[PDB]
Amino acid sequence: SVTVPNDDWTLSSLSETFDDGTQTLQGELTLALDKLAKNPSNPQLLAEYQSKLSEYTLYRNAQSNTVKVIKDVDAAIIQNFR
Amino acid sequence: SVTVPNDDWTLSSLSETFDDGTQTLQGELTLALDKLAKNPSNPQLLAEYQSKLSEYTLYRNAQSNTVKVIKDVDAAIIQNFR
Amino acid sequence: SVTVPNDDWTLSSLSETFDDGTQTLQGELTLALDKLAKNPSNPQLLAEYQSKLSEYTLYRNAQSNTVKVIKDVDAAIIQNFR
Amino acid sequence: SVTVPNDDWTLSSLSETFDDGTQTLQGELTLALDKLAKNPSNPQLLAEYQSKLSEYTLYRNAQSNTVKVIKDVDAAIIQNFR
Amino acid sequence: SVTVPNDDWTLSSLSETFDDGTQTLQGELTLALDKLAKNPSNPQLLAEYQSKLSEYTLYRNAQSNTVKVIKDVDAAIIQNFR
Amino acid sequence: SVTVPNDDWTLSSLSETFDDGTQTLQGELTLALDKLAKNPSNPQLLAEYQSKLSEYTLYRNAQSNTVKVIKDVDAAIIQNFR
Amino acid sequence: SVTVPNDDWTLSSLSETFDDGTQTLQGELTLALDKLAKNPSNPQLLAEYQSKLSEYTLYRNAQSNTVKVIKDVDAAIIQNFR
Amino acid sequence: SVTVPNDDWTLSSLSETFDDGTQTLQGELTLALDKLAKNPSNPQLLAEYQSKLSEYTLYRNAQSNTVKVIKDVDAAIIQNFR
Amino acid sequence: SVTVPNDDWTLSSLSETFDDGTQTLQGELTLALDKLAKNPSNPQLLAEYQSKLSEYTLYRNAQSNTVKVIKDVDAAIIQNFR
Amino acid sequence: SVTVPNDDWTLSSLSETFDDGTQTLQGELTLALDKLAKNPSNPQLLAEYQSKLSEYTLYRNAQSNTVKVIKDVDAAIIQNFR
Amino acid sequence: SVTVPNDDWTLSSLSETFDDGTQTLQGELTLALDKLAKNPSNPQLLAEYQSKLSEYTLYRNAQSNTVKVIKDVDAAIIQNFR
Amino acid sequence: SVTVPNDDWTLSSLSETFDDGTQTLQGELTLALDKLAKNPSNPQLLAEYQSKLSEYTLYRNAQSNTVKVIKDVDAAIIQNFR
Amino acid sequence: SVTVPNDDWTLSSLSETFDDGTQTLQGELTLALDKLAKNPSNPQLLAEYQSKLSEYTLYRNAQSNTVKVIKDVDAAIIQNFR
Amino acid sequence: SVTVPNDDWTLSSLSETFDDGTQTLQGELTLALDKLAKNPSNPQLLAEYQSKLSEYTLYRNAQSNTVKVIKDVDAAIIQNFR
Amino acid sequence: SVTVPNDDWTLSSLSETFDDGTQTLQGELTLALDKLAKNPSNPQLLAEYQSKLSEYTLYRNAQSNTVKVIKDVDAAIIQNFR
Amino acid sequence: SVTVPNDDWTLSSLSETFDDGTQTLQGELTLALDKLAKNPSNPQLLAEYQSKLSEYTLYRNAQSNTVKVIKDVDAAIIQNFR
Amino acid sequence: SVTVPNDDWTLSSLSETFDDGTQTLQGELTLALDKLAKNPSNPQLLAEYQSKLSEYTLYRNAQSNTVKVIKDVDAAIIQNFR
Amino acid sequence: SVTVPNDDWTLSSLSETFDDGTQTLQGELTLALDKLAKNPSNPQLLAEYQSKLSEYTLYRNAQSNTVKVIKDVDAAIIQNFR
Amino acid sequence: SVTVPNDDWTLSSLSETFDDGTQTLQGELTLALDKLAKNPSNPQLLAEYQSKLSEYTLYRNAQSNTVKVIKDVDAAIIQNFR
Amino acid sequence: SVTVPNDDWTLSSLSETFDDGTQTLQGELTLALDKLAKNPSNPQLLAEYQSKLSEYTLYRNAQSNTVKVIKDVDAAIIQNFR
Amino acid sequence: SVTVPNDDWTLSSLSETFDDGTQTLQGELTLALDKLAKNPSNPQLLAEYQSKLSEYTLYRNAQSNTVKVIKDVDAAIIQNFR
Amino acid sequence: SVTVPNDDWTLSSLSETFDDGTQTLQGELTLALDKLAKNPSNPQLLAEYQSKLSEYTLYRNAQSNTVKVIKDVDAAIIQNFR
């Protein structure tokens, strides 16, 4: 009915956000990676550069965790499932 | 008689609402889940993220309670029975 | 004679109404129940949700009183007896 | 006599209702089917999607039970016989 | 009778939804396709880009499965048959 | 007698439905036609756009079959004859 | 008779409206409350925020008067009695 | 009925706003905190940095009052209850 | 119906993006070309300057592949078809 | 009867869509035209700029085909006739 | 609703400006102070160095009036209140 | 009936606008105030800063007229009464 | 004889109407009452809300005159006596 | 008889419309009033704002003519008398 | 309605521009004035320094025409009226 | 009947559009006026600035034709009459 | 004899019809009157609104001819005499 | 007899439709007129704007043919005569 | 309807772009002119300075072709017509 | 929803600033260190060179406090958490 | 749309660079030429003075290759075309 | 959608940075190389001149490592992939 397309609408929008967030993550990923290379001097950038991301605790570093970066996008649809 | 289809009509509409509400719940579910992941920083979102839902007291968190989310849809028809 | 089928007619119609009213009650029952769940926020809906029904005084809440809801239909035929 | 057409009238109306209910069932059937496809995410819809229908207990799912959906219409006339 | 146009009404609406969903799928299809081309960098988008769609399990990728995208619209009327 | 106007009544109503269905068909016809033009991209819409209508099997496409669309209205009265 | 279900119908609809109005009031209530918190700067919002509601004179502020907000729903059925 | 999903809709939207406001608060929180650290020189920033927030009177400083920042989000749903 | 303009809307927006991306590609194209000429010294820029673009693998060089640059815009509408 | 205004309603809505689509076409027309002038550099835009529109195959270019653009609006009512 | 976050947005931006202006004032403050010390020779710089600031009339000298400099930032939020 | 919630709907929306306008006024108020302070140099800003607002004639200056700014919000509901 | 049941028939029907009218009055009563509360703004509704009912002259307001509303039903049987 | 409740029905419905129209007028009234205040700039809105309403000739401005706005509702029942 | 805040939005933005332009004029004013003083040598700067501004013909010199500079800001709102 | 409020609805909406268009015209009016003043250099803007508006032929310039701008709003209601 | 009550019966029924027709006329009268007021725009409604009624030729307008409306009821009994 | 009011009923309903259609025509009339003015650019709208209406062939343009628009309403009653 | 303001919106935006492009052209025009005067040495700048602009082929030189520069703005609205 | 990417946006920007500040700190760090080595003569530079940084009180010396310099970057994300 | 001015912006900037590079080339050209004349002694300067410029291989000597120097500027726009 | 061009934007900017950094590296490369040749005396410059670059540890010497210098640019896009 009307109801159905609602879900499509919501899902569509929702999925949209997910992609955006991930892509945003991608964007950051570029930045993060660049920084370390750019400025070797400060190890911290590197430290940030490589890390795991716990959601709350950690600062996600896209480059550091390949899985994380990839994970979000694929994850997101799973999240959609959730 | 006329009467019968009335029930069908009512039931149909009523059931319709239930699905909608649940789906709406689903929609929120997506949002809720996303938020926590999106913003690790604020634990509250997470706090909201995971909780039980009492109907009145609690704010339902779809993701937090899988059972809750699922529960509503199946519940609803039961509610129809009620 | 003619007279007899009159009673059948009347009774039939009358019974018809009873079922309708009850069913209507059922329909409301669905609505009422849904509302409380739907909107936890307003306790009043819940308050309405659970109550006894005096005929005059009370607002009947089908869900609140299982007996009431059931009662009407069975009652109605009794009423027919009355 | 007069009496005869009464039965025709009643039967006609009665049959009418049956068709309506079934058709209504058909209508729901469309909705139900659509929902699952539409929203894969919530398994419940699927769960509802496939089930048997006991009259009282179960929520009938037209698509799930082909026999059920078909059954009602043909059944109804049988019911008329009843 | 009245009943007939009901089916037409329902069917009409129902069919309407189907088209909408499919079209929505089309809309997503455009987005999905674009994304991969747009951002080569993240393979995931591509991964999403090409996949089969199980209804529940999979995330449907319109572009990936031509059949899927087409399938829904034609399917939908079949669904109407269902 | 009374009987006669009954037929008129029935016929009138019945004819009414027929017109409605056809008109409904007309309404769909507009939609169907529009869709294909509107969205060239999905051939399916076009595919639907042009087809024969078997009653059961086919999805009727008003625009595709001029005869079909016209057919129903004129047919309907014939149906009345039937 | 017919008459009876009429009352049920009317009452049902009428009650429906009442709930809607109240709920609407609830909706506003959320808005009203939010505004004051949101914008501390303008005291007026606060002023509106807290007030009594005379029906005609006053602008009802749900949050300001808890009793008012609650009052309407329960009141409404009383109104039904009226 | 229709009415129910209305509440869901309203609530959903309303809740949405709350999250936004809080998040906005979060955003400011980041800014506020940064400023003080960034510019030690002007104590005022610090002064702003730490304070209580009365709603009207005070300028809320997220960092200064941890409780405040957290409070809003959780509060908001409570507000929803209100 | 409503549905139709939806497609137009989506298509319009979608097409819009495509043009933007291509144009963006154009913009880059200008930059890329300029760089090589500007800085002969670093062959890499030239190397980048001329290449094929695989979507994922390659870095697209607009100038290097005339076809690629042109391709996207025309392609995009095709993509719209897809 | 009721039936008649139905057609008016449908027709009205349907016609509404047509105008919208055409107007949308107009809107695109403005964009399309502008682009070519704006960016001479990319011939493709021009190429798109001038073309015939087959419905499926071609990308319609309003400016390129004056007839096409005009055609749709006038056509649409004809389509209404269809 | 939407409306609420608007205020947050506006307020956020507005507050942002205030801080900027003040900070700018701070920046000038540094310059102003430096100048006098730097160039003792020209008393005017000193004269400028110390003064009250009327908004219109006076040239504000941050260093001269400690209160003024501080005043703006704290003032600004008050201004926000205004 | 239906009618009632219409008023609620209208009123709700209407009230919504009023708040928005006022808030907008608030937003401007912030800007206006800031400007004068920011740029003492141009008296005009100040001139604008302080003035009465006739509706048509005058340019309203929120800060200049406290009453005006406040007035609108409270006024608006009165306007609602009107 | 035959004659007697005639009176019963007539009386029964007649009484039926009376109840209906009164109930109808009741229905209006609900509406009328609701309106005033619903829309405080227009005093007229209130004005209508409270009034006496002359039969011809006045518009009866059930809520305004309790006696009137009650009066009709009891009156009606008296009317039957008349 | 049957006839009587017919009048009640008609009157009820008819009265319903009147209220609706008036209320609608009220709704417009809010809009109209708002506009002038909102946009002082265009005197026309004001011009519209204040005017008499001839039924045919004039555009009714609720706010401009208090009597008019009020008039309709009270008038309507008179109209009912008519 | 929605419409109203549109005007506010537009007006707000529009007014914003006006202020900006004027302020820009102010900025130029500073520059212009400075130049003449700075470089006495070239009379032209002075010549530019003092002049009337026709809109098209003349180059506006803020300092030269006090009225002009002031005029724009106040004018602008008038322009808003226009 | 139902029919009446339909006209009100339509008229209301229709009138709404008119105001919007006019207001939009107003908005443009502001822009148009500003441009000429802003950029004296290009006479064309001025040329556009002052002109008559034929509906089709001319580009309407609100400022140029006072009558035109005013005309639309008042006209619109006349148009409503049409 | 039997014969007498026949006349009473016939007369009673006949009179009944007359009242109904007149009342129906009354009902239309309400509608007719409303329409003109409701839609000033179309003079035709007004034209219809005021007219004489020849029986065959004219369309009776109750409101237009007070005498006509009244006339029918009183007339009817006269007609009974006829 | 019964028969008579039947005609009244039918006529009443039938007339009702006519008015509706005409009014609908009126509604379209508003739209049609608006469009041309709104969008001068597309002559087609104008072309549609002015035309004769053959019933089948032509698309009726209310504004274009004053007579047509008026004609329908008055015509309709004539049609009733037919 | 809604549709109309859409065109206004689109047109408004579209026109906006045109002005921008032209103005941009104006901006370039200033630059281009300046360059030649500034650097007599390189004839190329002059060569660029004076030329015709074919859209694709030529590089437009505003100063060189007065008509071109002017042309765009006026043209643009024509383009709007297109 | 929209909301989510907002946080990403804000966070992204916010994080960006943090890095910048830290990096800026790094830049200063280089300068500070260099100075002392460069100019042994003035101990003050050295004194500045080595110190703790309280935020307000102290002048941070990156080199002096290794922890401080490092601290900011890592801290910043923590700050983000804050 | 927005998109268009983007191209203008990009193109404008891009073109800007080209001119700059060429001009820079011009600047070098002056230097290069001067050097040879200035220092006859070192033939190398002369050798550099006259040469062809391959982009990568050669060091461009503006004076040596007149065509080269000129070429870049004109070329650049061509490059823009590219 | 919007989202797509975001990536393009980000990527474009990001890529821009990479080129800049590399080019910067190129610039340094020139300096570094020059220094050693310029000042043979200090071997350190030479030592710096030739080295490997670890990112953190080493100071990159463009000339020393040809691969490094080249590597960055090509690498960067790879980094983009990352």
Short mmCIF file of N, CA and C in Angstrom, two decimals, chain I residues 13-14 16-18 20-22 24-25 28 31 35 38-39 41-45 48 53-59, chain V residues 1-2 4-5 8-9 11-12 15-16 19-20 22-23 26 69-71 73-82:
data_model
loop_
_atom_site.label_atom_id
_atom_site.label_comp_id
_atom_site.label_asym_id
_atom_site.label_seq_id
_atom_site.Cartn_x
_atom_site.Cartn_y
_atom_site.Cartn_z
N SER I 13 17.48 14.73 -10.72
CA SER I 13 18.55 14.93 -9.78
C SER I 13 19.68 14.07 -10.21
N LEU I 14 19.37 12.80 -10.56
CA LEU I 14 20.42 11.86 -10.80
C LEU I 14 21.22 12.36 -11.95
N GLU I 16 21.62 15.18 -12.79
CA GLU I 16 22.33 16.37 -12.42
C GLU I 16 23.66 15.94 -11.91
N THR I 17 23.67 14.88 -11.08
CA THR I 17 24.89 14.49 -10.45
C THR I 17 25.85 14.11 -11.52
N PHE I 18 25.36 13.38 -12.54
CA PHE I 18 26.24 12.81 -13.52
C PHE I 18 26.96 13.94 -14.16
N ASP I 20 27.53 16.74 -13.05
CA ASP I 20 28.45 17.38 -12.16
C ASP I 20 29.71 16.59 -12.15
N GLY I 21 29.60 15.25 -12.04
CA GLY I 21 30.79 14.47 -11.89
C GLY I 21 31.63 14.66 -13.11
N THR I 22 30.98 14.62 -14.28
CA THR I 22 31.73 14.69 -15.50
C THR I 22 32.42 16.02 -15.52
N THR I 24 33.20 17.83 -13.19
CA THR I 24 34.25 17.83 -12.22
C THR I 24 35.41 17.21 -12.90
N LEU I 25 35.15 16.14 -13.66
CA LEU I 25 36.20 15.46 -14.34
C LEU I 25 36.80 16.46 -15.27
N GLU I 28 39.11 18.64 -13.45
CA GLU I 28 40.35 18.02 -13.12
C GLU I 28 41.15 17.97 -14.37
N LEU I 31 43.16 20.74 -14.82
CA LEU I 31 44.26 20.83 -13.91
C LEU I 31 45.32 19.89 -14.38
N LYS I 35 49.26 20.69 -15.40
CA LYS I 35 50.35 20.38 -14.54
C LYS I 35 51.49 19.91 -15.37
N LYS I 38 53.03 22.52 -17.10
CA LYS I 38 53.62 23.47 -16.21
C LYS I 38 54.91 22.91 -15.74
N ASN I 39 54.89 21.66 -15.24
CA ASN I 39 56.11 21.14 -14.70
C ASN I 39 56.52 19.99 -15.55
N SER I 41 59.35 18.94 -15.39
CA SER I 41 60.48 18.30 -14.78
C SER I 41 60.08 16.95 -14.31
N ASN I 42 58.91 16.84 -13.65
CA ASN I 42 58.55 15.59 -13.07
C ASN I 42 57.75 14.84 -14.07
N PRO I 43 58.33 13.77 -14.53
CA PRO I 43 57.75 12.93 -15.53
C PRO I 43 56.52 12.30 -14.98
N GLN I 44 56.42 12.18 -13.64
CA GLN I 44 55.35 11.41 -13.10
C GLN I 44 54.09 12.09 -13.49
N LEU I 45 54.09 13.43 -13.44
CA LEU I 45 52.90 14.17 -13.69
C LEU I 45 52.48 13.81 -15.07
N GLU I 48 51.08 10.38 -15.12
CA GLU I 48 49.72 10.44 -14.72
C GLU I 48 48.98 11.02 -15.86
N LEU I 53 42.12 4.86 -18.01
CA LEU I 53 41.53 4.79 -16.72
C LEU I 53 40.77 3.51 -16.65
N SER I 54 41.23 2.56 -15.82
CA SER I 54 40.30 1.57 -15.38
C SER I 54 39.56 2.24 -14.29
N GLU I 55 38.31 1.84 -14.02
CA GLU I 55 37.62 2.59 -13.02
C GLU I 55 38.34 2.40 -11.73
N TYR I 56 38.43 1.15 -11.24
CA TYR I 56 39.05 1.00 -9.96
C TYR I 56 40.51 1.27 -10.09
N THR I 57 41.19 0.54 -10.98
CA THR I 57 42.62 0.50 -10.86
C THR I 57 43.17 1.85 -11.16
N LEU I 58 42.74 2.41 -12.30
CA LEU I 58 43.54 3.45 -12.85
C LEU I 58 43.13 4.74 -12.27
N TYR I 59 44.05 5.71 -12.33
CA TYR I 59 43.69 7.06 -12.06
C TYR I 59 43.34 7.62 -13.39
N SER V 1 23.60 10.92 -6.25
CA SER V 1 22.82 12.02 -5.65
C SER V 1 23.70 13.17 -5.33
N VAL V 2 23.40 13.87 -4.22
CA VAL V 2 24.28 14.88 -3.75
C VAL V 2 25.53 14.18 -3.39
N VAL V 4 27.24 11.76 -4.35
CA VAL V 4 28.27 11.38 -5.26
C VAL V 4 29.23 12.52 -5.43
N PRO V 5 28.79 13.71 -5.76
CA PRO V 5 29.71 14.74 -6.12
C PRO V 5 30.52 15.07 -4.93
N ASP V 8 33.54 13.30 -5.29
CA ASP V 8 34.36 13.88 -6.32
C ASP V 8 35.03 15.06 -5.72
N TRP V 9 34.26 15.85 -4.95
CA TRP V 9 34.80 17.05 -4.40
C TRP V 9 35.94 16.66 -3.52
N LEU V 11 37.65 13.97 -3.32
CA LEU V 11 38.74 13.33 -3.97
C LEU V 11 39.51 14.39 -4.67
N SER V 12 38.80 15.32 -5.32
CA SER V 12 39.48 16.31 -6.10
C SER V 12 40.37 17.07 -5.17
N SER V 15 43.21 14.95 -3.91
CA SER V 15 44.23 14.67 -4.87
C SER V 15 45.04 15.91 -4.99
N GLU V 16 44.38 17.07 -4.86
CA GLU V 16 45.05 18.31 -5.09
C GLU V 16 46.17 18.39 -4.12
N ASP V 19 49.24 16.32 -4.94
CA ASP V 19 50.09 16.84 -5.96
C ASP V 19 50.90 17.92 -5.34
N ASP V 20 50.25 18.74 -4.50
CA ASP V 20 50.95 19.86 -3.96
C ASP V 20 52.11 19.34 -3.17
N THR V 22 53.74 16.63 -3.33
CA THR V 22 54.78 16.05 -4.12
C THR V 22 55.54 17.17 -4.74
N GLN V 23 54.81 18.16 -5.29
CA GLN V 23 55.45 19.22 -6.02
C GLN V 23 56.33 19.91 -5.05
N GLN V 26 59.14 18.30 -4.89
CA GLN V 26 59.96 18.59 -6.02
C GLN V 26 60.72 19.84 -5.73
N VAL V 69 61.12 10.42 -4.92
CA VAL V 69 60.48 11.63 -5.36
C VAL V 69 59.34 11.26 -6.24
N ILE V 70 59.61 10.38 -7.21
CA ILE V 70 58.63 9.98 -8.18
C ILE V 70 57.55 9.31 -7.41
N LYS V 71 57.95 8.55 -6.39
CA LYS V 71 57.09 7.62 -5.75
C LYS V 71 55.93 8.36 -5.20
N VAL V 73 54.22 11.04 -5.96
CA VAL V 73 53.11 11.47 -6.75
C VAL V 73 52.29 10.28 -7.12
N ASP V 74 52.93 9.23 -7.67
CA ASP V 74 52.17 8.11 -8.13
C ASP V 74 51.54 7.48 -6.93
N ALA V 75 52.27 7.48 -5.82
CA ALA V 75 51.89 6.84 -4.61
C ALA V 75 50.64 7.50 -4.19
N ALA V 76 50.57 8.83 -4.36
CA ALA V 76 49.54 9.58 -3.72
C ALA V 76 48.21 9.08 -4.19
N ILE V 77 48.07 8.84 -5.50
CA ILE V 77 46.81 8.40 -6.03
C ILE V 77 46.53 7.05 -5.46
N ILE V 78 47.58 6.24 -5.30
CA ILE V 78 47.38 4.97 -4.70
C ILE V 78 46.84 5.24 -3.34
N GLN V 79 47.39 6.27 -2.67
CA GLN V 79 46.98 6.61 -1.35
C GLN V 79 45.54 6.96 -1.43
N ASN V 80 45.15 7.62 -2.53
CA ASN V 80 43.78 7.97 -2.70
C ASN V 80 43.02 6.69 -2.69
N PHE V 81 43.56 5.65 -3.35
CA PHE V 81 42.86 4.40 -3.36
C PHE V 81 42.73 3.95 -1.94
N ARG V 82 43.84 4.02 -1.19
CA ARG V 82 43.79 3.64 0.19
C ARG V 82 42.71 4.47 0.87
#
